[PDB]
Write a structure and sequence with these properties.
The structure is a homodimer.
Chain A: E1 2-4, E2 12-18, E3 25-31, E4 39-41, E5 52-53, E6 56-58, E7 61-63, E8 67-69, E9 74-77, E10 85-87, E11 91-93, E12 100-101, H1 103-108, E13 112-114
Parallel strand pairs in A: 3-12, 4-11
Antiparallel strand pairs in A: 2-3, 2-9, 5-8, 6-7, 8-11, 9-10
Bound molecules: the ligand COC(=O)N[C@H](C(=O)N[C@H](C(=O)N[C@@H](Cc1ccccc1)[C@H](O)C(=O)N1CSC(C)(C)[C@H]1C(=O)NCC(C)(C)C)C(C)(C)C)c1ccccc1.
The ligand COC(=O)N[C@H](C(=O)N[C@H](C(=O)N[C@@H](Cc1ccccc1)[C@H](O)C(=O)N1CSC(C)(C)[C@H]1C(=O)NCC(C)(C)C)C(C)(C)C)c1ccccc1 sits at the interface of chains A and B.
PDB class: hydrolase/hydrolase inhibitor
Keywords: hydrolase, HYDROLASE-HYDROLASE INHIBITOR complex
Assembly: dimeric
């Protein structure tokens, strides 16, 4: 679908995410052309799973602690299309429960920006 | 234009930004549907403008040193339209001098996200 862009309303989508360490869960994610990679909340992962340290630069600053990197690919199913997005890896929010669909996922569902 | 999305290339455009505190200047800005508000570099402003402190939530978390708010509206001319976008205020990055076109500006140019 076409998602209008509105400062007062964050463009979001329901996405079924399977981290392959837990039953797949559907979450609300922000659609974010400004994110190099997708961010999944740590909650969707089972307690014990190996995750890699990683450094992330955001607007608030550079962090070595807040985010981890997955070890297994994450599969994402969008409401409209039946084929899953397969992300070889993406980020995990250990801290603030964030869910962000970045350009890695947007590329695979052939998302575009349109500026008339 | 239609702008494709690719994890390995930031979606950017050249814009002319007028802060009304000196002459209009060209910047290359990130098109960012995850940004509630536009971000322009402090480098645009002279060494003694007055800018209000502001708190912002980013990926590095809550920052309250990094961004200021303009005191005057900012006018933005995009290559493909004659009428400038006029933002009542936007964020000013004093740390990294980032340029990010957010949803406030995208709404004014009727920007949309399209997922097939
Ligand atoms: C109350 O006023 C606000 O705090 N607005 C915030 C905002 O828009 N922050 C933007 C922001 O950082 N948005 C980002 C998404 C985001 C929103 C809130 C917390 C964390 C992340 C942005 O689309 C992005 O990907 N950016 C901006 S900077 C960047 C490096 C180019 C890239 C990035 O962070 N990449 C890192 C990853 C891949 C982890 C997202 C600004 C500072 C650029 C205006 C906000 C507050 C709650 C939910 C959503 C947004």
């Amino acid at each position: 679908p076409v998602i209008p862009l509105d400062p007062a309303r964050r463009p979001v989508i329901k996405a079924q995410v399977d981290t392959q360490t837990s039953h797949p869960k559907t979450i609300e994610a922000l659609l974010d052309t400004g994110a190099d990679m997708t961010v999944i909340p740590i909650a969707l992962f089972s307690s014990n799973t190996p995750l890699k340290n990683t450094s992330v630069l955001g607007a608030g600053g550079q962090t070595q602690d807040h985010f981890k990197l997955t070890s297994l690919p994450v599969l994402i199913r969008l409401p409209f299309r039946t084929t899953p997005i397969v992300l070889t890896s993406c980020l995990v929010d250990t801290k603030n429960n964030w869910a962000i669909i970045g350009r890695d996922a947007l590329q695979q569902c052939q998302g575009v920006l349109y500026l008339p």
